[PDB]
């Protein structure tokens with residue numbers, strides 16, 4: 001028996017309520033729709049880790065989670081020019097660890113964004129909202145505008161979703177943590193491709209080819225950018241150079257060049273950081 | 277030409293972006309879908325007042341608004357036990373003034389909730405999100421779970437929407453401003469009717485009759501509450517007694533007994549308060 005304290009969130013995932021056990025006074029988040037609740041519960045049972053939100057119990061279907069005090073979106077609102085470089089590295093390390101556990105379990109998250117990065121009172125980052133996650137050994141949801149800001153160009157172009165594009169989202173979040181700004185804030189899909197090339201240069205031949213084969217863009221003008229800026233220039237005086245290197249290998253335009261989790265966690269940036 | 281700074285919000289209303297004029301550096305909220313954009317723009321032009329969000333311009337259809345620094349939802353998160361009694365009265369007065377202008381223009385808002393109460397840097401409350409507002413002289417959207425917490429019982433029961441139920445929502449917000457707690461937090465429609473009667477007593481005969489005639493509730497158990505608590509008891513030591521009187525006349529179960537705007541703004545609670 002839970003007393004309802006408030007609404008945590010509502011969307012494609014459904015409705016999450018902030019609740020309190022009438023006996024223990026513990027605060028929880030209870031997820032119900034009105035679907036993919038059972039899929040999420042299965043993945044949540046598989047995915048147990050310090051950087052993944054804990055599912056505490058299920059009943060009649062409703063999922064009861066640990067309630068977490070904040071997300072990254074609120075953190076960037078309180079610190080609109082970025083967080084300290086130490087905190088940028090700490091949060092990206094923790095996020096990478098959570099994605100690593102997902103990927104080792106053959107699960108791709110598909111919706112990494114500041115909104116689903118919970119930051120506990122002890123500053124522990126936790127990933128949530130597996131309502132669009134997929135197991136690659138099966139078959140097969142999606143989201144809104146803020147959720148394309150973190151999407152790789154090949155996905156904007158319609159490629160299949162895999163471990164690479166979760167790594168892309170990590171890089172976008174790395175940048176935004178460092179200066180508070182969305183890195184590729186398109187106002188539409190096309191303006192997103194422009195912003196991406198304005199930083200990283202022209203998409204590889206194959207992505208442009210998808211641009212002309214994809215009827216979403218029929219008759220549309222390709223956003224050619226003459227003079228790309230570069231991330232070194234984009235983040236000069238913001239990221240230290242080692243972490244900048246890590247971000248350079250998360251944001252390779254060709255998904256085949258992107259570091260996956262094992263390589264990310266082995267990067268020099270996190271050498272002293274893994275220990276703590 | 278606007279540089280995109282971030283996403284303000286996304287929902288049934290569409291997508292609102294936080295943007296900046298490349299020339300003036302003014303921050304604005306730009307509303308676009310992907311419908312009722314034109315309806316909203318018409319109402320926004322009619323509805324011009326200090327407690328209603330200012331629409332600044334329209335182009336190609338996109339609506340550019342003043343950007344406002346916070347909403348009431350964030351205020352209740354920062355002050356989870358309520359705001360000072362003076363601030364409760366000040367915000368409810370301002371909200372009532374905004375609804376009064378809407379109602380005098382034959383417009384009912386239909387979605388009053390903390391999320392659409394903007395509170396400026398000068399502590400000026402502004403109403404927004406007229407994407408579900410209606411003009412009573414015409415014909416005819418709706419929302420989520422948090423948006424039924426502010427719905428009158430006759431509306432939960434399926435009555436038509438009118439000025440009365442906007443007054444109901446005002447009362448719910450009055451209570452929640454005073455102690456930080458949603459007043460009627462149902463987990464479903466039925467639990468909402470229970471919570472309402474647990475405070476205000478049994479619904480009038482006619483609302484119960486709608487309960488049995490409405491197939492939404494076919495075969496369902498009516499939430500009979502034996503011992504209602506009362507608002508005097510519910511808010512003892514929280515609301516002063518004069519404002520408690522105003523809340524008693526906003527939360528009459530029979531919509532015919534509720535104060536409308538003219539009566540609210542004439543209540544003794546706001547006698548010294550109107551002047552400032």
Ligand SMILES: CC(C)c1cnc(CSc2cnc(NC(=O)C3CCNCC3)s2)o1
Pocket residue numbers: 008009010013016029031053065066067068069070071074115116118128129130
């Ligand atoms: C986040 C998204 C809507 C979602 C899908 N599924 C779940 C359930 S898991 C959760 C446990 N604690 C949570 N904490 C937060 O989101 C809070 C609320 C926002 N302000 C403080 C930070 S949500 O959330």
Ligand SMILES: CC(C)c1cnc(CSc2cnc(NC(=O)C3CCNCC3)s2)o1
Pocket residue numbers: 284285286289292305307329341342343344345346347350391392394404405406
């Ligand atoms: C609110 C809702 C989504 C909506 C529908 N239509 C509009 C456009 S009008 C606006 C102008 N300023 C605005 N300010 C706020 O909501 C802010 C953002 C949240 N944190 C700080 C408070 S929204 O908003």
